[PDB]
């Protein structure tokens, strides 16, 4: 299992514009297009992202290409963030995939806001960090995905995904 396969299980793949769990326009593998309510603003962002007139539909290839960039961006965002980088550096390979996953879903800003859990992860206090992460809108809004990410952090194994 690896980050790509992990995120592919969490986000799924849709080749036509769709609405995410929060109601925002998305396409592909969890690629957010816009938080605006307009399907047209959504189609525009899609064409700009792909480089062609898409009419809100893309191909598998196009989807994976966006996915590749977005994982790359997630990692570089972590490495560039003063709050995130130390945490990341401190973690083993599996748990790093868990933090990338959170960043991909909620952005660098959001994750960075998990001050206490981050501190507990740095300290390697798995069980306590897992309890802290669960007290969040995140866990309440997408509980199954959250449990999977959280177990990854608690265990350092891919069990939740197997
Ligand atoms: Cl883009
Ligand atoms: Cl969920």
From Swiss-Prot:
What are the catalytic residues? 11, 20
* Record annotation: effect of changing residue 117 to F: 10-fold decrease in enzymatic activity
Altering residue 30 to F: what's the impact? Almost complete loss of enzymatic activity. The enzyme is destabilized by 1.5 kcal/mol
Entry's Gene Ontology cellular component terms: host cell cytoplasm
Alphabetized UniProt keyword annotations: Antimicrobial, Bacteriolytic enzyme, Cytolysis, Glycosidase, Host cell lysis by virus, Host cytoplasm, Hydrolase, Viral release from host cell
Q: What Gene Ontology molecular function terms does this protein carry? A: lysozyme activity
- HAMAP family under this entry? ENDOLYSIN_T4
**Similarity remark:** Belongs to the glycosyl hydrolase 24 family.
**Name listed for the protein in its UniProt record:** Endolysin
- Organism expressing this protein natively: Enterobacteria phage T4 (Bacteriophage T4)
């Amino acid at each position: 299992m690896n980050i790509f396969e992990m995120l592919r299980i969490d986000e799924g793949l849709r080749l036509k514009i769709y609405k995410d769990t929060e109601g925002y326009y998305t396409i592909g593998i969890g690629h957010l297009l816009t938080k605006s309510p307009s399907l047209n603003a959504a189609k525009s962002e899609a064409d700009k992202a792909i480089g062609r007139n898409t009419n809100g539909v893309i191909t598998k290839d196009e989807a994976e290409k966006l996915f590749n960039q977005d994982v790359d961006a997630a990692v570089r965002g972590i490495l560039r963030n003063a709050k995130l980088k130390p945490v990341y550096d401190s973690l083993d390979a599996v748990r790093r995939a868990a933090l990338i996953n959170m960043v991909f879903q909620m952005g660098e800003t959001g994750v960075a806001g998990f001050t206490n859990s981050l501190r507990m992860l740095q300290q390697k206090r798995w069980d306590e960090a897992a309890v802290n992460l669960a007290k969040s809108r995140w866990y309440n809004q997408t509980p199954n995905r959250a449990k999977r990410v959280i177990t990854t952090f608690r265990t350092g194994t891919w069990d939740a995904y197997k």
